[PDB]
């Protein structure tokens, strides 16, 4: 189907300062932090927008920290409990009246193995849209 207009080409989510003592146990995680994507002027005939996610994964399957903190990975979810690791997809309905679409997402830091160490958190998740 014909494409919408991407409103949010870039989005940032800042997990802020996390303390290593709170990321000690295996499976420990930060609070969720919201991030959202928006599309506009979805043409007539286009009623669903599919986002395909990608980014470098580490051995845990979650997104790899490109920063220096060790034993940290990044998790992306939608607003319904679905994990969106690399290669995942999520589809939303275009709002019929406004001809817009949006993706309410959330990110957290996770230590799968435990024992997070001090350092930066840095990652980039890429999204390609398809239309139906």
């Amino acid at each position: 189907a014909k494409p919408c207009t991407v409103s949010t080409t870039n989005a940032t989510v800042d997990l802020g300062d996390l303390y290593s003592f709170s990321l000690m146990s295996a499976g420990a995680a930060s609070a969720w932090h919201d991030v959202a994507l928006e599309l506009t002027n979805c043409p007539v005939g286009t009623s669903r927008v599919t986002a395909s996610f990608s980014g470098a994964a580490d051995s845990t399957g979650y997104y790899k920290n490109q920063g220096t903190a060790q034993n940290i990975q990044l998790e992306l979810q939608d607003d319904s409990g679905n994990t969106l690791n690399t290669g995942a997809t999520k589809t939303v309905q275009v709002d019929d009246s406004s001809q817009s679409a949006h993706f309410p997402l959330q990110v957290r830091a996770l230590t799968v193995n435990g024992g997070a160490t001090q350092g930066t958190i840095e990652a980039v998740i890429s999204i390609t849209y398809t239309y139906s």
Binding site: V6, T8, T9, N10, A11, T12, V13, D14, L15, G16, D17, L18, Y19, S20, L23, S30, V35, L37, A51, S54, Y63, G67, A69, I72, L74, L76, L105, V107, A109, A116, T117, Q118, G119, T120, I121, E122, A123, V124, I125, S126, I127, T128, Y129
Partner: peptide
């Protein structure tokens, strides 16, 4: 990519 999400943060001792 059509969109990119940048994730930022810091783990502090």
């Amino acid at each position: 990519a059509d969109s990119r999400i940048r994730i930022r943060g810091y783990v502090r001792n």
